[PDB]
């Protein structure tokens, strides 16, 4: 049942990563995307 | 034989007036509180 | 009943007349004194 | 002495609801036209998979010769869909202190909800009375008394008594006294209310003009239900950007991006809510034109 | 103590309370740490 | 004499499917990482309400010393989700003529669809043979022969014979011959096929580099079902914008924006489909990162 | 001719045909008119 | 029945306007918005 | 009494081979067509 | 059966090995000759 326990840990850690990365894509990522794009815009404008 | 289970209903009414006097008392308390606190 | 009727009447008058009333007070003031008149076309489109 | 006016009890309970995001679903268009500084007209088109889609037409009138301040009362605002459902608000100033708000929602040709509110302002304190959803033919309806006094320049305390009568209330009449207070501590504005049933507490924390954070808890003592939220707002005029997003203690997570697209007064709003309990996600997008 | 704590987790309101007060106080800790934070600073 | 190669029968049937928009639902994130000009890796996250929502991981390999041209064959491309559903394509060149494509989709740990296709490109003509969804243990499967010859520099004509065997086919074997042609005078390109059991016609028209318009009809003589579309594409590099939108003769209307956000290689995609028969709108938005 | 044309409109395939060939030829008429059109001209 | 006939026409005029304006908001309007915004940007840049 | 309603099935097979020869014939036609058209 | 087994084996090998195969041929070529090596972090981070 070691493999099944690894399938257990895998499916759990898969789901945990899913909830984390979908949440970040909502909460943080839109800020990161526009803040990065605005920073590169300022860089290219200042370059 | 009962005309009405009024007692629970009137006790709720008694607590409603109790809420009113408590609402007034807390306003009276805070109306005194700043003097009491600065005194 | 006097109120039985008048309440339904007055609420129906509010219900249909409020946007009419807002619009009326608007066209009463009109645009600013220097601006072109508020033709109803200004309600219909930009 | 020389204390502030504390606001009003509804502004404490709303204190941290301003940064909490207001997500929407589907595609929404709004066109606003300013016909005068007294008269504005707005056309809004709502397309949604599950929200009832439709047009609604809105108009706003403000200001008369009686009222001096920049508030420019009265305010007379309402918007109606082609089906005839009306939302409208009325606001009045019986004096510079005593202020009144009225709001009514009509749908299905029926007044489904209404409230009338009175708000009075003293140098150190506020008192307000509200009546809502009245029956006109019967005693039934809702009443709320509210009181709030500044006690120290960093502290305010107050009181509230909601009341209801009639068949909507399980007891023929019910009322709930509840204390209220706010403590400023500079940035760290605490707020909350303690009821004979239920409790609510905001925490609010302005970090900077670019970042505002708050938290909530809610609790109910006869309903045995409680929730909380952690919510933040980002304001980035350097990026023509505002973002509101928060975690819900029922594990909804929401974010409502909005972009102003130019000096040309378009804004684009993107609304995402994920219900991590149901693995369900609801997207909305919409354009507002100023 | 899982025999104790699970008796909370298993019970809706007691768990709803723990969840709500937990995330709330976490927000208080985070907020008091965030007070210096800016994302695109002046 | 010395005519163009006409392409292949599938390129005629696709001729106007390139400007037809491909709408999507919900929120989709894609990250592309170029590891070398021979090796690319892409991570895609799709959050969606009714469309199946999840992650899939993609990788692409291209090019070996055997293959000279800028096509840089072979191509060896596949992407897999954590549930183990695999999509993969293989493309090979026994020479410059006799090109070969292979594709297989595996889901539920099973090959659900596959095809193998050859292209022989013969100057003035093309010949192609396809086999698809083969049973390995049984004779059953799909076969298609296709032929297309340039007849005049403005005009091409050809032929097609699809075939199927086995329990998926109502007759133990069935095949359908169908003529094919294309005509290209001026800007306009006509295309279509006349079968024993159906008809399809594209009209296609470049107005300018900024605007491309096409139309379809489809018809079936044994199924008694027919549809049509009118679809257009706008290309606006000045606006970093492309838009594909079209009316369906079943009264769906679709529009799919894509906005490249910057020289920084984000593209936003905004997808709107409204089924005016059902008054039903499906929104999608997504970000591709290059 | 509403007694005639409705007999088509009432029948799914015949109406599907009329709709599909209609919108198709409308697209042909429109396209043959659009050939000169530009949207953000050079 | 004249009023009811006007209610018939009116509800038909709802559908016609609804289908038209929702369709335009999909098909044309995204082009108009971005083309207008780009033209105003070019105007402000050239102004 | 019938062993099989084979006739419809074999007629479908006959039309399948008819489709094959027609497919070939149209290729033969187009293979001749440009000469016939320039002729 | 010889094919009864070998077909299922070979399809299982394609099913699980194709992305392994693409990745292997990728790291076989690696980066461009002047670029830093393709550490497996290249599969995981930008
Ligand atoms: C089978 C072979 C798989 C090989 C995978 C190799 C890649 C490993 C990476 C983690 C994958 C994983 O674990 O992702 C797990 C989950 C998806 O889980 P799910 O069950 O589909 O969720 C849905 C649940 N359903 C199936 C029941 C419906 O996605 C993620 O969290 C997304 C990971 C994104 C990683 C982005 C990296 C780049 C960041 C750049 C800087 C911002
Ligand atoms: C380019 C820059 C300028 C653009 C200017 C745009 C102007 C607005 C265009 C119409 C927008 C739209 O979408 O209107 C759509 C609506 C109809 O929709 P509906 O009834 O909800 O359809 C769904 C049907 N339901 C709701 C039953 C499900 O049409 C109209 O009847 C309104 C036309 C405008 C008239 C304004 C006065 C309305 C008074 C109503 C009193 C009851
Ligand atoms: C919580 C959300 C999760 C989901 C993923 C979120 C991704 C976040 C993306 C951030 C950037 C962003 O929103 O950009 C949105 C962009 C803004 O940039 P721009 O157009 O280049 O203008 C700014 C120029 N700059 C980049 C050089 C500074 O405007 C648009 O697209 C405009 C779309 C107009 C049409 C609106 C829809 C109408 C109805 C539907 C029609 C089919
Ligand atoms: C804020 C930073 C710290 C985040 C810490 C998160 C710990 C999560 C522990 C879950 C315990 C739980 O709730 O487990 C039980 C839950 C489901 O039951 P329920 O939630 O009570 O729903 C029932 C509601 N009733 C009581 C009203 C009936 O399980 C689940 O399948 C859902 C788990 C979703 C987790 C989402 C995490 C989001 C993280 C975002 C990071 C950016
Ligand atoms: C600017 C973009 C405009 C888009 C207009 C969309 C209109 C959608 C109306 C749906 C009503 C409906 O229900 O349509 C479907 C039904 C007919 O099918 P049924 O009787 O229900 O049979 C069941 C369905 N079968 C037969 C497939 C099995 O009625 C109609 O076909 C009449 C609608 C005529 C619309 C004419 C539009 C002309 C547009 C010209 C410019 C291109």
Residue numbers in the entry:
A (entry chain C), H (entry chain D): 77 to 123
B (entry chain I), I (entry chain J): 7 to 45
C (entry chain E), J (entry chain F): 9 to 54
D (entry chain A), F (entry chain B): 55 to 344
E (entry chain G), G (entry chain H): 7 to 48
Any passages from the paper?
The translocase of the outer membrane (TOM) is the main protein-import pore of mitochondria, recognizing nascent precursors of mitochondrially targeted proteins and transferring them across the outer membrane. TOM core complexes are membrane-embedded stoichiometric complexes with two pores, each containing five subunits: Tom40, Tom22, Tom7, Tom6 and Tom5. The main component of TOM is its translocation pore, Tom40, which is closely related to the mitochondrial porins; the 19-strand β-barrel has an internal α-helix (α2) that limits the size of the pore. The small TOM subunits Tom5, Tom6 and Tom7 are membrane-embedded single α-helices that adopt characteristic shapes and interface with the outer surface of Tom40, shielding regions that are exposed to the cytosol.
A 3.3 Å resolution map and molecular model of a TOM complex from Drosophila melanogaster, obtained by single-particle electron cryomicroscopy, is presented. The core TOM complex extracted from native membranes of the D. melanogaster retina contains transgenic Tom40 co-assembled with four endogenous TOM components: Tom22, Tom5, Tom6 and Tom7. The final model contains all subunits of the core complex, comprising two copies of the 19-stranded β-barrel Tom40, two copies of the precursor receptor subunit Tom22 and two copies each of Tom5, Tom6 and Tom7. In Saccharomyces the C-terminal helix is present but veers away from the β3–β4 loop in the structure. Both the Drosophila and human Tom40 structures lack a C-terminal helix, terminating at the 19th stave of the barrel [Fig. 5(b)].
